Amino acid sequence: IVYAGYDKPDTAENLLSTLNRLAGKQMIQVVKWAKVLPGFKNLPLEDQITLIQYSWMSLLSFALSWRSYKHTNSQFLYFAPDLVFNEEKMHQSAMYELCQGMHQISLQFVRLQLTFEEYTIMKVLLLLSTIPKDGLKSQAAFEEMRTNYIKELRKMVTKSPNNSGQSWQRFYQLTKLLDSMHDLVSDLLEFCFYTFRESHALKVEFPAMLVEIISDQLPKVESGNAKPLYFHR
């Protein structure tokens, strides 16, 4: 459970700095989770780093949707126990739009009554959702791992008695939800890349973990060396 330490005047700059500090602390937890994941643990170090650098925002967004769903029935974005709000608190158009988009994903968790077991496998699929344009160092090992997790989700959904009569439709709704994460996450990253580059002028602070990740991720994304993987596109 990572706390935000939400202080200072309520400005967009100060809120973003608080969220970035929080995102850096959450990222320490994400790396520890990824490190012991079956299959991933076996990938070469450069590939493990590549995958986390492309999908960090997707992993944080999906975890935010889960917290929001579990703690507020997706009425608010539950960033931390001390930082809970939705788009209604946003005065700037872009920030309102990004919160509203995140709110809509969390509402899909309510629509589906997403289970913790589904969430756990789907989170792994997001870690494996973007690769380099020319693939990874161990592209075959990665492809086997990704296929195995897709099959794990499919089997869990279709075999569950809670889904009888509509399990294949549910599996396709879950994979459509994973595809919809690409659109939202691209928008969040565009905002993040902007505040990162304009950090001094905007007064938006970033912790060392994020400075290092964004510095490696941004040239990849800018050069078109980012291949998103879709289930339905």
Binding site: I28, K35, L45, I49, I52, M209, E212, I213, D216
Partner: peptide, 12 residues
């Protein structure tokens, strides 16, 4: 030479 925080956490 100096390792990133991500590399440190993945290798510790």
């Amino acid at each position: 030479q100096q390792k990133s925080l991500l590399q440190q956490l993945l290798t510790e």
